[PDB]
């Protein structure tokens, strides 16, 4: 019983964090094999010019007390790809994957090249995440673990004026096309991911929370017309709810009607501790936490 936003265990990723310092700048890097990846703003902008006048010896890269020699540096989008003189023997089996809006992953928040905290997040429709980071957090990785393979999907880059957080993928591509520049950028509007809200309500039912459950139904078509005027995403397919609908005996259409009434008001009650709809849980997370 219960539903909690949780992270996958961080041990295999902890051994990959390094401190990367250049001049007056210090942040985190990800050490895999003989390469360290970090946000390129550590050398700050004309980033190509910055790279062109780099002195390799002005780097200080360390894993705990172990310093790494810098062999070479190349640009990789919004990242530096830094070749170092030692292989990380604790490199896990890994992949890279760019995540899509609505998908969950884990953040390992790091400072001074050491992991400080771990928490789960979900990529918003405007390509930002609801993080907690202060200065020095850049280079903190986002990851998922599948079959012991670590899928790296995020390296922290910056915070927007509103306080929400933007990273790049490990290919160096900034999520949402935000610039790694100290300029005025404002994140786009975001909508609640209806598919995730549905997952949350199924979790609520499985946990005995039913007070909000509509007798009424709304067809997916009609809901989607309401959704786009009311800050929620459209539902196109409902395959991801077959298991949960079978486990509970409640179909998506009844939950969609419930969403409509709960979007405006929870009326002073709570659902699993929440007083407003949440879209931070995917169907995958819910199925895992309910059924293993």
């Amino acid at each position: 019983a219960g539903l909690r936003k949780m992270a996958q265990p961080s041990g295999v990723v902890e051994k990959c964090i390094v401190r990367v310092c250049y001049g007056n700048m210090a942040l985190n890097g990800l050490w895999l094999g003989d390469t360290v990846m970090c946000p390129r703003h550590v050398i700050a902008i004309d980033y190509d010019y910055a790279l062109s006048v780099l002195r390799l010896h002005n780097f200080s890269i360390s894993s705990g007390n172990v310093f790494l020699g810098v062999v070479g540096v190349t640009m990789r989008g919004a990242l530096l790809q830094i070749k170092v003189n030692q292989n990380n023997v604790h490199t896990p089996k890994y992949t890279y994957r760019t995540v899509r809006p609505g998908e969950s992953f884990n953040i390992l928040a790091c400072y001074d090249g050491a992991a400080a905290g771990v928490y789960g997040v979900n990529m918003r429709s405007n390509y930002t995440i609801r993080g907690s980071f202060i200065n020095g957090a850049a280079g903190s990785p986002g990851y998922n673990i599948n079959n012991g393979t670590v899928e790296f999907c995020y390296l922290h880059q910056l915070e927007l004026g509103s306080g929400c957080h933007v990273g790049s993928d490990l290919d160096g591509v900034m999520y949402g096309g935000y610039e790694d520049q100290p300029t005025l950028q404002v994140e786009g509007a975001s909508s609640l991911f209806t598919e995730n809200v549905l997952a949350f309500l199924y979790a609520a039912l499985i946990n005995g929370s039913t007070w909000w459950l509509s007798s009424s139904r709304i067809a997916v078509d009609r809901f989607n017309e309401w959704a786009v005027h009311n800050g929620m995403t459209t539902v196109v397919n409902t395959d991801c709810f077959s298991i949960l609908a079978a486990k509970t005996g409640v179909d998506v259409q009844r939950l969609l009607a419930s969403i409509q009434s709960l979007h405006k008001n929870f009326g002073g009650k709570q659902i699993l501790g929440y007083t407003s709809l949440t879209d931070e849980f995917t169907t995958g997370e819910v199925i895992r936490q309910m059924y293993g």
Partner: peptide
């Protein structure tokens, strides 16, 4: 002012 979170 975007804040690039380097220390």
């Amino acid at each position: 002012l975007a804040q690039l979170q380097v220390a």
